[PDB]
C-alpha cells in the first residue's frame, strides 16, 4: 500500500531515490517468515511496476 | 454522556458547542424534528438508567440541568449566528420527551402492608426522572406546556388509577397548577371547565384516599395536594 | 355531578344487561328484547356512546369511559347476533352516515383556530373505531364510490401539505383520522402510490412532502402499511430504484417494530424480511457501481439490520435467498471502492456465516496493509481506518470466534510487533478463549498447532490466552489430544530452535494445570530436553528450566527430583 506511496513518489518527483529503492526492498523482502503467496505477488507486481518506473525517467 | 464529569469550564464549552450543533439541525427542518426526538429520547433513556444507592466514577444527573438553563438562555450566540423559537422547541421537545417515557413507565410490583418492587429499574428511572424534572420544571412556565396541562392531568390520572402511588404525579401537578393559576387557567372552553372537574375530583378522592398511606408516601401525598390551586 | 354519577352508573348496568340480553339470551330469547319494543335505547345510548356528552357529560371522566370503549364493541358484536344488528345499524346511520366529515374537512386546522369541532371529529372518530373493532368496518360506513375510501387520505394529505406554507392536538387528530383510513381496507397500495410524492417544499428549504407525511406517524404508518406483507413493499422495491429514503425508512420501522413485536410474535416481521430477502434480486439498480455510495451503504445497513434480526443460522447457508443475497454481499465485499471504514462495516457481518467465504476473506485482507502500520504514522487517516478497521476486525470474531477467523486475524497481525494493537487483540483473545465451546476452542487450539508450522513468533503472538483463559475441560481435553502429538515432538538450526521454543511454551502450561498413565515416561522426556546445561543457547537455558518449573507443579513438588 506504501508501494505506490513511494512509486508516486518517484515518478513525480524523478529521481533514484535510493531511499524508496530501500522502502520497496522492505516490501519486496517481507517473506522470509512468511509461507503467504499472495504477499509474494502483491509484492513481485509492486516491484515490475518500480522496475518500469526506473525505466521511465532516470533509474 | 460525555456532558457529566465535567468541571465547569469544559462543561460550559459542551453545552455551547451543544446549543451551537442544535440550532445547526435546526436549521435544517426535517432534520431537526427527527434528530431533536431520537436524541431527547435516547437522552432521557441515559439519564433514568442512573442508578442510585439507598441511604471518572459514575455521572451524575445534576449537572444536564444547567444545560438546560444554558439552553433557556443561549441567545448569545443564536443571534450572532442568526446575523450571518428556540426555547420553544427546548420546551417542546422536552415535553415530548419526558411524556413519551414516562408512558414506557412498567411498574409491577407486590407486598412480598409490605412492599415488594418488582420493578426496581423502573423505580430508579423514576426517581432519576422525577429528580431532573424538578430540577428543570420550575422555571419555565406554561406558556409551551399550557394546552399540554390539559392531556398532562388526564393521563397522570390514569397512571394514579393503575398506581396510586407515585408522588411525581402531583409534582408535575404542583408546579402544573404553579403555572396554571399563575396564568389563572380558571376564570369561573369545555376544556377549561372539564379540567376543573378533573382538579377537583381528582383531589377530593385522594383527600379521601390518604388514610391508606404511609410515611414518605402519605406526607408527599399531602404535599402532594396542598400544592393544588385556591 | 353525583346526579350524572348516578345516570352513568344506571346506563353501565342497563347497557351490561342490554349485552346480556343479546348474550346471555341469544336470538331464542330475542323476544325479551322485544320486551324493550321502542327500544328507545336504540336511540339514545348510541348517542351516549358516540357522545358521553349523551350520559350528562360523563364528567369525572373515570375508568366507566375508559371501559366505553371495548364494552360499546361488546354492545355491538352482541347486537351483531341479535336480530336488532340492521335496526341500530340504521340507528347509527340516521346519528351519522359521514355527514360530518364533508364540512368537517374545514375544521380550521393548524393553530388554536375551532377545537370544539376536533373535539366533536376525534369522539366521532372513536365511535367509527369502536365500530371497526365491532367488525362494523363498512357497514355502518356509507362507504367510498370507489372502492377505496379515498375519504381520509386525499384531504389528510392536502391538508398536511398546504396548513404549513404544526400542531401535536392537530397531530393526534390526524392520527386518528389515519385509524380511521385504516379501518377502511384496501387503501395500503393507494397510499403506496401515493406516498411517494416528489412534491417538494417551498419555503430556506425545499424538499419532497410525502415522505415527511409519513413520517410524522412513521410507525403507525408502517403497520398499516405491512398488513399488505410485501405485496406493496414489491411494488416499492419496483419504484425505490431512485429514492430508498422512503422505503428504508419504513424497512427500519417495521424492523425494530419486528423487534417490538416479539412478545406476541417475532415472526410474523421474520416472515416478511425472509420474504422480502427473496424478493431483493427484482430490483438490483444498488449495491453495485449502480447507486450512491451513499445508497451502497444503506442497503449494507439494512440487509445488516435483516441479518440480526433473523437467526443468523437463518440463511448462512443455502436457505432461499442465502445464496442470491449471500452473493450480493459477496459483490460488496469484492466493491473494494470503499472508504477503508465502509470495508469494516461490510466485515461487521461477516460471521453471519464455504471456502469462497475465506478466499474472499484473504483477497479483501490483503489490500489494507503490506506488514506494518507504525509506516502510517498515527493520526494519519488512513492511520485511524486501519485501527477503526482492527477493532472491527476483533468485535466481529470474537463474536465468530471460529478457528478460521482467528488464524486469519493472527496471520495479518503476525507482521509485525505491536502494529496491530496487539494489547485489544489479546484482550479479544481473553474474551474468546472464556467463550466458545470446548470443542469450538480445541479447534481453535488445532488451528493455532497447524499454523505454528521468527518461525517462533507466530505462536508467540498468541498462545498465552490460549493457554490460560480457556476452560480446563477444551485445555484437558486438548492436553489428551496431544499427548502423542507431543510425545512425538519432542525431537537451518534457527528454525528448528524456534520450534523447541513453541514446545516449550505449550508444554509448560499444559502441566501447570493438572496431570494420564505415561506419567514418568513425560517427565524424563521433557527433562533430558532440558538437562543440557547463540544466544539460542540462553534462550534454551531459560526456556527449558521455566518448563521444568511448570513441569514441578504437580509431581516433584516435593524434594529428591530423581538426579
Given at each position: 500500500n506504501?508501494?505506490?506511496?513511494?512509486?508516486?513518489?518517484?515518478?513525480?518527483?524523478?529521481?533514484?531515490?535510493?531511499?524508496?529503492?530501500?522502502?520497496?526492498?522492505?516490501?519486496?523482502?517481507?517473506?522470509?517468515?512468511?509461507?503467504?503467496?499472495?504477499?509474494?505477488?502483491?509484492?513481485?507486481?509492486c516491484?515490475?511496476?518500480?522496475?518500469?518506473?526506473?525505466?521511465?525517467?532516470?533509474? | 454522556?460525555?456532558?457529566?464529569?465535567?468541571?465547569?469550564?469544559?462543561?460550559?464549552?459542551?453545552?455551547?458547542?451543544?446549543?451551537?450543533?442544535?440550532?445547526?439541525?435546526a436549521?435544517?427542518?426535517?432534520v431537526?424534528?427527527?434528530?431533536?426526538?431520537?436524541v431527547?429520547?435516547?437522552?432521557?433513556?441515559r439519564?433514568?438508567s442512573?442508578?442510585?444507592?439507598?441511604?471518572?466514577?459514575?455521572?451524575?444527573?445534576?449537572?444536564?440541568?444547567?444545560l438546560?438553563?444554558?439552553?433557556?438562555?443561549?441567545?448569545?450566540?443564536?443571534?450572532?449566528?442568526?446575523?450571518?423559537?428556540?426555547?420553544?422547541?427546548?420546551?417542546?421537545?422536552?415535553?415530548?420527551?419526558?411524556?413519551?417515557?414516562?408512558?414506557?413507565?412498567?411498574?409491577?410490583?407486590?407486598?412480598?402492608?409490605?412492599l415488594?418492587?418488582?420493578?426496581?429499574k423502573?423505580?430508579?428511572?423514576?426517581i432519576?426522572?422525577?429528580?431532573?424534572?424538578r430540577?428543570?420544571?420550575?422555571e419555565?412556565?406554561?406558556?409551551?406546556?399550557?394546552?399540554?396541562?390539559?392531556?398532562?392531568?388526564?393521563?397522570l390520572?390514569?397512571?394514579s388509577?393503575?398506581?396510586?402511588?407515585?408522588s411525581?404525579?402531583?409534582?408535575?401537578?404542583?408546579?402544573?397548577?404553579?403555572?396554571?393559576?399563575?396564568?389563572?387557567?380558571?376564570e369561573?372552553?369545555?376544556?377549561?371547565?372539564?379540567?376543573?372537574?378533573?382538579?377537583?375530583?381528582?383531589?377530593?378522592?385522594?383527600?379521601?384516599?390518604?388514610?391508606?398511606?404511609?410515611?414518605?408516601?402519605?406526607?408527599?401525598?399531602?404535599?402532594?395536594?396542598?400544592?393544588?390551586?385556591? | 355531578?353525583?346526579?350524572?354519577?348516578?345516570?352513568?352508573?344506571?346506563?353501565?348496568?342497563?347497557?351490561?344487561?342490554?349485552?346480556?340480553?343479546?348474550?346471555?339470551?341469544?336470538?331464542?330469547?330475542?323476544?325479551?328484547?322485544?320486551?324493550?319494543?321502542?327500544?328507545?335505547?336504540?336511540?339514545?345510548?348510541?348517542?351516549?356512546?358516540?357522545?358521553?356528552?349523551?350520559?350528562?357529560?360523563?364528567?369525572?371522566?373515570?375508568?366507566?369511559?375508559?371501559?366505553?370503549?371495548?364494552?360499546?364493541?361488546?354492545?355491538?358484536?352482541?347486537?351483531?347476533?341479535?336480530?336488532?344488528?340492521?335496526?341500530?345499524?340504521?340507528?347509527?346511520?340516521?346519528?351519522?352516515?359521514?355527514?360530518?366529515?364533508?364540512?368537517?374537512?374545514?375544521?380550521?386546522?393548524?393553530?388554536?383556530?375551532?377545537?370544539?369541532?376536533?373535539?366533536?371529529?376525534?369522539?366521532?372518530?372513536?365511535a367509527?373505531?369502536?365500530?371497526?373493532?365491532?367488525?362494523?368496518?363498512?357497514?355502518?360506513?356509507?362507504?367510498?364510490?370507489?372502492?377505496?375510501?379515498?375519504?381520509?387520505?386525499?384531504?389528510?394529505?392536502?391538508?398536511?401539505?398546504?396548513?404549513?406554507?404544526?400542531?401535536?392536538?392537530?397531530?393526534?387528530?390526524?392520527?386518528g383520522?389515519?385509524?380511521?383510513?385504516?379501518?377502511?381496507?384496501?387503501?395500503?397500495?393507494?397510499?403506496?402510490?401515493?406516498?411517494?410524492?416528489?412534491?417538494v417544499?417551498?419555503?430556506?428549504?425545499?424538499?419532497?412532502?410525502?415522505?415527511?407525511?409519513?413520517?410524522?406517524?412513521?410507525?403507525?404508518?408502517?403497520?398499516?402499511?405491512?398488513?399488505?406483507?410485501?405485496?406493496?413493499?414489491?411494488?416499492?422495491?419496483?419504484?425505490?430504484?431512485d429514492?430508498?429514503?422512503?422505503?428504508?425508512?419504513?424497512?427500519?420501522?417495521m424492523?425494530?417494530?419486528?423487534?417490538?413485536?416479539?412478545?406476541?410474535?417475532?415472526?410474523?416481521?421474520?416472515?416478511?424480511?425472509?420474504?422480502?430477502?427473496?424478493?431483493?434480486?427484482?430490483?438490483?439498480?444498488?449495491?453495485?457501481?449502480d447507486?450512491?455510495?451513499?445508497?451502497?451503504?444503506?442497503?449494507?445497513?439494512?440487509?445488516?439490520?435483516?441479518?440480526?434480526?433473523?437467526?443468523?443460522?437463518?440463511?448462512?447457508?443455502?436457505?432461499?435467498?442465502?445464496?442470491?443475497?449471500?452473493?450480493?454481499?459477496?459483490?460488496?465485499?469484492?466493491?473494494?471502492?470503499?472508504?477503508?471504514?465502509?470495508?469494516?462495516?461490510?466485515?461487521?457481518?461477516?460471521?453471519?456465516?464455504?471456502?469462497?467465504?475465506?478466499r474472499?476473506?484473504?483477497q479483501?485482507?490483503?489490500?489494507?496493509?503490506?506488514?506494518q502500520?507504525?509506516?502510517?504514522?498515527?493520526?494519519?487517516?488512513?492511520?485511524?481506518?486501519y485501527?477503526?478497521?482492527?477493532?472491527?476486525?476483533?468485535?466481529?470474531?470474537?463474536?465468530?470466534?471460529?478457528?478460521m477467523?482467528?488464524?486469519?486475524?493472527?496471520?495479518?497481525?503476525?507482521?509485525?510487533?505491536?502494529?496491530?494493537?496487539?494489547?485489544?487483540?489479546?484482550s479479544?483473545?481473553?474474551?474468546?478463549?472464556?467463550?466458545?465451546?470446548?470443542?469450538?476452542?480445541?479447534?481453535?487450539?488445532?488451528?493455532?498447532?497447524?499454523?505454528?508450522?521468527?518461525?517462533?513468533?507466530?505462536?508467540?503472538?498468541?498462545?498465552?490466552?490460549?493457554?490460560?483463559?480457556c476452560?480446563?475441560?477444551?485445555?484437558?481435553?486438548?492436553?489428551?489430544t496431544?499427548?502423542?502429538?507431543?510425545?512425538?515432538?519432542?525431537?537451518t538450526?534457527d528454525?528448528?530452535?524456534?520450534?523447541?521454543?513453541?514446545?516449550?511454551?505449550?508444554?509448560?502450561?499444559?502441566?501447570?494445570?493438572?496431570?494420564?498413565?505415561?506419567?514418568?515416561?513425560?517427565?524424563?522426556?521433557?527433562?533430558?530436553?532440558?538437562?543440557?546445561?547463540?544466544?539460542?543457547?540462553?534462550?534454551?537455558?531459560?526456556?527449558?528450566?521455566?518448563?521444568?518449573?511448570?513441569?514441578?507443579?504437580?509431581?516433584?513438588?516435593?524434594?529428591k527430583?530423581?538426579?
Amino acid at each position: 500500500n506504501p508501494a505506490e506511496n513511494f512509486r508516486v513518489l518517484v515518478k513525480q518527483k524523478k529521481a533514484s531515490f535510493e531511499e524508496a529503492s530501500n522502502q520497496l526492498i522492505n516490501h519486496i523482502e517481507q517473506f522470509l517468515d512468511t509461507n503467504e503467496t499472495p504477499y509474494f505477488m502483491k509484492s513481485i507486481d509492486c516491484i515490475r511496476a518500480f522496475r518500469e518506473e526506473a525505466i521511465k525517467f532516470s533509474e | 454522556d460525555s456532558f457529566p464529569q465535567y468541571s465547569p469550564k469544559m462543561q460550559l464549552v459542551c453545552c455551547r458547542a451543544i446549543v451551537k450543533v442544535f440550532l445547526a439541525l435546526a436549521a435544517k427542518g426535517p432534520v431537526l424534528r427527527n434528530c431533536i426526538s431520537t436524541v431527547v429520547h435516547q437522552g432521557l433513556i441515559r439519564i433514568c438508567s442512573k442508578p442510585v444507592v439507598l441511604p471518572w466514577k459514575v455521572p451524575t444527573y445534576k449537572d444536564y440541568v444547567d444545560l438546560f438553563r444554558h439552553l433557556l438562555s443561549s441567545d448569545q450566540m443564536m443571534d450572532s449566528i442568526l446575523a450571518d423559537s428556540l426555547n420553544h422547541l427546548l420546551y417542546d421537545e422536552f415535553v415530548k420527551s419526558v411524556l413519551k417515557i414516562v408512558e414506557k413507565l412498567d411498574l409491577t410490583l407486590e407486598i412480598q402492608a409490605n412492599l415488594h418492587p418488582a420493578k426496581p429499574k423502573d423505580f430508579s428511572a423514576f426517581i432519576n426522572l422525577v429528580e431532573f424534572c424538578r430540577e428543570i420544571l420550575p422555571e419555565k412556565q406554561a406558556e409551551f406546556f399550557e394546552p399540554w396541562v390539559y392531556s398532562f392531568s388526564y393521563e397522570l390520572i390514569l397512571q394514579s388509577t393503575r398506581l396510586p402511588l407515585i408522588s411525581g404525579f402531583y409534582k408535575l401537578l404542583s408546579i402544573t397548577v404553579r403555572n396554571a393559576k399563575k396564568i389563572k387557567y380558571f376564570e369561573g372552553d369545555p376544556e377549561k371547565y372539564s379540567c376543573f372537574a378533573l382538579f377537583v375530583k381528582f383531589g377530593k378522592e385522594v383527600a379521601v384516599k390518604m388514610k391508606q398511606y404511609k410515611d414518605e408516601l402519605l406526607a408527599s401525598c399531602l404535599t402532594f395536594l396542598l400544592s393544588l390551586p385556591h | 355531578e353525583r346526579y350524572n354519577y348516578s345516570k352513568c352508573t344506571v346506563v353501565v348496568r342497563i347497557m351490561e344487561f342490554t349485552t346480556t340480553l343479546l348474550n346471555t339470551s341469544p336470538e331464542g330469547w330475542k323476544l325479551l328484547k322485544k320486551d324493550l319494543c321502542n327500544t328507545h335505547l336504540m336511540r339514545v345510548l348510541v348517542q351516549t356512546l358516540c357522545e358521553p356528552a349523551s350520559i350528562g357529560f360523563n364528567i369525572g371522566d373515570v375508568q366507566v369511559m375508559a371501559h366505553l370503549p371495548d364494552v360499546c364493541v361488546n354492545l355491538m358484536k352482541a347486537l351483531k347476533m341479535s336480530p336488532y344488528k340492521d335496526i341500530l345499524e340504521t340507528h347509527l346511520r340516521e346519528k351519522i352516515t359521514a355527514q360530518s366529515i364533508e364540512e368537517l374537512c374545514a375544521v380550521n386546522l393548524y393553530g388554536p383556530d375551532a377545537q370544539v369541532d376536533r373535539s366533536r371529529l376525534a369522539a366521532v372518530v372513536s365511535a367509527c373505531k369502536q365500530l371497526h373493532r365491532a367488525g362494523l368496518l363498512h357497514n355502518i360506513l356509507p362507504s367510498q364510490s370507489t372502492d377505496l375510501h379515498h375519504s381520509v387520505g386525499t384531504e389528510l394529505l392536502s391538508l398536511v401539505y398546504k396548513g404549513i406554507a404544526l400542531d401535536l392536538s392537530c397531530k393526534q387528530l390526524a392520527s386518528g383520522l389515519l385509524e380511521l383510513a385504516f379501518a377502511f381496507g384496501g387503501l395500503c397500495e393507494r397510499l403506496v402510490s401515493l406516498l411517494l410524492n416528489p412534491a417538494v417544499l417551498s419555503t430556506v428549504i425545499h424538499f419532497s412532502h410525502g415522505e415527511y407525511f409519513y413520517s410524522l406517524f412513521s410507525e403507525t404508518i408502517n403497520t398499516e402499511l405491512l398488513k399488505n406483507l410485501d405485496l406493496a413493499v414489491l411494488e416499492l422495491m419496483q419504484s425505490s430504484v431512485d429514492n430508498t429514503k422512503m422505503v428504508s425508512a419504513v424497512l427500519n420501522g417495521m424492523l425494530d417494530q419486528s423487534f417490538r413485536e416479539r412478545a406476541n410474535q417475532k415472526h410474523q416481521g421474520l416472515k416478511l424480511a425472509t420474504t422480502i430477502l427473496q424478493h431483493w434480486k427484482k430490483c438490483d439498480s444498488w449495491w453495485a457501481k449502480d447507486s450512491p455510495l451513499e445508497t451502497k451503504m444503506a442497503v449494507l445497513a439494512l440487509l445488516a439490520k435483516i441479518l440480526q434480526i433473523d437467526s443468523s443460522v437463518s440463511f448462512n447457508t443455502s436457505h432461499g435467498s442465502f445464496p442470491e443475497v449471500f452473493t450480493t454481499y459477496i459483490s460488496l465485499l469484492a466493491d473494494t471502492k470503499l472508504d477503508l471504514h465502509l470495508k469494516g462495516q461490510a466485515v461487521t457481518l461477516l460471521p453471519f456465516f464455504l471456502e469462497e467465504l475465506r478466499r474472499v476473506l484473504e483477497q479483501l485482507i490483503v489490500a489494507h496493509f503490506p506488514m506494518q502500520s507504525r509506516e502510517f504514522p498515527p493520526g494519519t487517516p488512513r492511520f485511524n481506518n486501519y485501527v477503526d478497521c482492527m477493532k472491527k476486525f476483533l468485535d466481529a470474531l470474537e463474536l465468530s470466534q471460529s478457528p478460521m477467523l482467528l488464524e486469519l486475524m493472527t496471520e495479518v497481525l503476525c507482521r509485525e510487533q505491536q502494529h496491530v494493537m496487539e494489547e485489544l487483540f489479546q484482550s479479544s483473545f481473553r474474551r474468546i478463549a472464556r467463550r466458545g465451546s470446548c470443542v469450538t476452542q480445541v479447534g481453535l487450539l488445532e488451528s493455532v498447532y497447524e499454523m505454528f508450522r521468527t518461525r517462533q513468533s507466530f505462536v508467540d503472538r498468541s498462545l498465552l490466552t490460549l493457554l490460560w483463559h480457556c476452560s480446563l475441560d477444551a485445555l484437558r481435553e486438548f492436553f489428551s489430544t496431544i499427548v502423542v502429538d507431543a510425545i512425538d515432538v519432542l525431537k537451518t538450526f534457527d528454525t528448528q530452535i524456534t520450534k523447541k521454543m513453541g514446545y516449550y511454551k505449550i508444554l509448560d502450561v499444559m502441566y501447570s494445570r493438572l496431570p494420564n498413565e505415561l506419567t514418568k515416561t513425560l517427565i524424563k522426556l521433557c527433562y533430558d530436553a532440558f538437562t543440557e546445561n547463540l544466544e539460542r543457547r540462553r534462550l534454551y537455558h531459560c526456556a527449558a528450566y521455566n518448563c521444568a518449573i511448570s513441569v514441578i507443579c504437580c509431581v516433584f513438588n516435593e524434594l529428591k527430583f530423581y538426579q
